[PDB]
Amino acid sequence: SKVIGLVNPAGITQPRRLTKAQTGDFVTGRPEDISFLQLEKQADFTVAK
Amino acid sequence: SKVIGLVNPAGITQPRRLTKAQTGDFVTGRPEDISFLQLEKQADFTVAK
Amino acid sequence: TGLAEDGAKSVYERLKNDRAPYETRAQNCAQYTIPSLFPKDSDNASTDYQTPWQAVGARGLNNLASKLMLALFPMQTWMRLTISEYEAKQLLSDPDGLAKVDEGLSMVERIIMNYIESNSYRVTLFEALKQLVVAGNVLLYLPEPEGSNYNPMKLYRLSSYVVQRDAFGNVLQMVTRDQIAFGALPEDIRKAVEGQGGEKKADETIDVYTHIYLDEDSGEYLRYEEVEGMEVQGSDGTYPKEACPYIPIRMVRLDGESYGRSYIEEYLGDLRSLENLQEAIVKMSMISSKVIGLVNPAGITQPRRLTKAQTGDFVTGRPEDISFLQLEKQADFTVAKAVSDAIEARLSFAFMLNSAVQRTGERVTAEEIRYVASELEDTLGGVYSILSQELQLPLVRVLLKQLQATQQIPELPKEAVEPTISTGLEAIG
Amino acid sequence: AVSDAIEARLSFAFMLNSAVQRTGERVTAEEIRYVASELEDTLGGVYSILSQELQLPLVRVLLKQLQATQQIPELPKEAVEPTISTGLEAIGRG
Amino acid sequence: PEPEGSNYNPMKLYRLSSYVVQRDAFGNVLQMVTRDQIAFGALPEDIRKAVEGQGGEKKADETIDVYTHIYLDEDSGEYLRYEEVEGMEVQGSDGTYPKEACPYIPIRMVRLDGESYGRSYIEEYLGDLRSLENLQEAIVKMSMIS
Amino acid sequence: TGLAEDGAKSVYERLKNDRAPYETRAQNCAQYTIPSLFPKDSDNASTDYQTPWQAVGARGLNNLASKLMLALFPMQTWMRLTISEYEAKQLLS
Amino acid sequence: ECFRYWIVTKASRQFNNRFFGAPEVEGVLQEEEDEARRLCMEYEMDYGGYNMLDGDAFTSGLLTR
Amino acid sequence: ITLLPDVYSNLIVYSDDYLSLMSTSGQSIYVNRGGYVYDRTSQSDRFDSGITVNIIRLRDYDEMPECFRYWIVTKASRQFNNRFFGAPEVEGVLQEEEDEARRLCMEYEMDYGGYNMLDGDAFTSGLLTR
Amino acid sequence: ITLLPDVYSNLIVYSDDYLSLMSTSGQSIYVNRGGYVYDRTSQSDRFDSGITVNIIRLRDYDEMP
């Protein structure tokens, strides 16, 4: 339950454009550049549960 | 909920033609040029829920 | 003269500052639930109240008022008058005395209800319940009945009236503003305002303030009506606390606050989240419901041929050249909708939206009123327990004394003239 | 998907038929009271509001006109002009 | 209308465009006027002689507007009714309606304070109605392209 | 005669300007539910009221009016005449 | 300034193609011109500030409610 | 930042030091005509009381973040090698070095910016109110 | 760590030693302008009572792990 946006430094997308832009605003960037940190323990959760 | 149109800068497509065009208007561009920023946290959402 | 020393308007304007926070909240609750119900003071006759993006609030507000009114005022008798402090001599002996008074008390109650329904009290009471849910509180005033006339009870919105309370919770003073046209003024008021000076047209609107205050000398409540700073002579009168026809009713009481708070305000922070989520969903669909043909410039296909050609016309081109702009937020749509559904279900039980038995009611039934009543206690808190006690009982007291002078009272022994009153569920059986 | 969702909100607000009243081939007092209760569940209280503003005045005017046509056997005006109740109490025998 | 005997007497319905009303914040009616355009031949006999008494030849198919104004008398709380044709009051048409029993029944579905008129039930859900209008319009149009 | 001093002609005109927002609302509301119920002043005999793109408003408007009529005005009695010659003495004596 | 750089780096690449061809200089200037072109696009989107919800002609009327 | 016009001339100077001139809102309405700021939407280059805009202003090589200094050098190193003594062996290395230099500078940019999508965001901040 | 201005001048020095300045929490505001610490948001290069920032300072080849 924690949001962290992992911006790929080799990417073109810059968070300053994303945060300042309003809803439905065209922003220069690429979707693969933006990613989010995720907990990978899916197998560990099902065995623990 | 927030909509952000991530336009690939290397792409042909320009947002000016997209916005000015009426409904059912042919606009020079490519579909893969335009993309939208999405929150990809699905594993986190399902484990938290 | 105590509180009335400043006047009726000076105290009214002085107390606006305390009323202002409650007005702001009441407008906010309205904005997300049927905004026409509580309108802003500035807005009038050209407002075009915008519908909320979410419809749970408007549906929930109507449901709570409908459910409350069913339990609060059932079709069957909902008032019971009981006698105490002398039942010892009346219960043990005199079997005939008990039968006579019970019929007599039943005579009063049925006559009371005929006055309620014939005078269109129910239609005004339902309006109060809707205003209680969205706004903090409402004041209900019962004017005296004169002769044989149809006199609807007068409800006052939170903006119209003011009332002051201490930490104890009793009413210190209350002031009410009322807008009446000069032509519509009664005989006493119109002659007084004309004596003030000038000529008033019929369409001209003036404000009247009725101040009800607790003088230091005695516990009686004195009320006076003033027009443009001068009191009309016939307005002055002294009323006891129990028999005051000016009834301020608060749904959610807080210690040290003169005003109640709305039920919705606890969920208003949640309808705000629901409205934002539903606002984006419709706006995303508005983007989606747009046709843009993305022609690949490196392609062969030219839109001039496609548009000019008739149906079933061979046109030189390639299908891959033509493409259409699409909204890509598929993952974001399902997460936003998933949260919105969870919020809606959360609000469903809060507003009593889902109830299978309550959905189908063919007629009013004694057990059904109790079942409606029980649900208002299991959920929704104890508003029925508290709001009705602040509402139903004072209406019975004030109406009883007003009608008792007008109505004929037979020979009734000792406490039978003034029986103890039970309301709500506890009077159903 | 969105248009269907919007339709659901409007269908409930306008009381679009869900076999609530379409079922049945007869009109009875019980069905009328069922609709009267439903009209208070939704639509705020327009059934009550119209009862004061439409149902009540309409009776009062016709009562005066019908008074001239039919002479009430009882001379007193109260018997001539009885108090009028136009709510759910009017629906049904009593 | 008045029963006027056993003859058939239908209720007359005035659309919001036809009539007008003024109210105070109290909710009571101050003054109100209804506009009725009726052909000269179809005019009532009392109205017909008034128009003829006014002067000027009128064709039968030509329609003359009639105004029925009821207002509170400032001296006494009684409704006063009169009709005017072409700015001239109809003689003998003047009458004092009984207090709070005038045959005109102004009706507002939704009552708002400080507002002389009333609002429809649809306007509460007009927005959801027009949003559905936009969505279904595009759905049909996309089917037209296909 | 202060209210009628201008005459019904003038008082109609000034107060008509008050109802101008309301007839605008009704026309806008009608445009989406059924354009026929509330038509504009200008259009007449050649209107050709375009159908709404959604029929929910039309389907709901007719249903709403019908439901009201059944409860408000059925064939059964819908006014109750309650006699009270006195407030309490009528039944006693 | 974004466009002034692009014009120069485009003219610089054009200069050696036509008149005096240097293979390694062309290789880099091609990459540089693509990078310069990309930046001028980002300038235009930042300058334009185009909005699909309210900015555009069509959807703006739809959202008004 | 506020650009102030000369009260006598009434027009602002758009000097070459101004790398970029953009309006704070979504749509930028200021362009250059004759070296002076020009309002294209208003068809007027005469301003009164000044304007509020977003400007990128040129700085020296110093008065720069240190993380950016190596990227400036590494890019300039590539061109300088390319223009005068173009050696493929060193050119390949510098291209790899420049890509790492850009990666670090973006890493600096996110660290410096501290952008928050929940509360720093213009749109989303209003939504989080409860 | 705090940076204190000169009492008379009210200016802090952005020395060549300082490899980076960043604000403690986020959205770093202090930037170099003319060799002195400049607060871009407040548009003032004059400070009093000092400022609290995160500093990377140069060290020798030694003193490094």
Numbering used by the authors:
A (entry chain K), B (entry chain L): 294 to 342
C (entry chain A): 6 to 434
D (entry chain B): 343 to 436
E (entry chain B): 148 to 293
F (entry chain B): 6 to 98
G (entry chain N): 132 to 196
H (entry chain M): 67 to 196
I (entry chain X): 67 to 131
What does the paper say about this structure?
The tail, connected to a unique vertex of the head by the dodecameric portal gp8, consists of the dodecameric adaptor protein gp11 and the hexameric nozzle protein gp12 (20, 24) surrounded by six trimeric tail fibers gp17 (16, 22, 24). In this study, using a 300 kV cryo-electron microscopy (cryo-EM) and defocus refinement with Z-height correction, we provided improved structures of core proteins at a resolution of 3 Å, the portal–tail complex in mature T7 at a resolution of 2.7 Å, and the portal–tail complex in LPS-induced DNA-ejected T7 at a resolution of 3.5 Å.
Compared with the tail structure of the mature T7, the hexameric tail nozzle of the DNA-ejected T7 undergoes conformational changes, leading to the opening of the tail channel. Hairpin A of one gp12 molecule is close to hairpin B of the adjacent gp12 molecule. By contrast, in DNA-ejected T7, hairpin A of each gp12 molecule rotates almost 90°, leading to the formation of an extended gap for the attachment of the gp14–gp6.7 complex (described below) in the tail channel. Each gp14 molecule consists of two antiparallel α-helices connected by a short loop. Moreover, each short α-helix of gp6.7 binds to the turn of the two antiparallel α-helices of gp14, forming a three-helix bundle, and each long loop of gp6.7 connects the cleft between two adjacent gp14 molecules. Six copies of conformer B of gp6.7 are located outside the channel, staying in the opposite direction along the channel compared with the conformer A. Moreover, each short helix α1 binds to the distal end of the two antiparallel α-helices, forming a three-helix bundle, and helix α2 binds to the interface of two adjacent nozzle proteins of gp12 and the turn of the antiparallel α-helices of gp14. The gp14–gp6.7 complex embedded in the open nozzle extends the tail channel, with the distal end of this channel connecting to LPS.
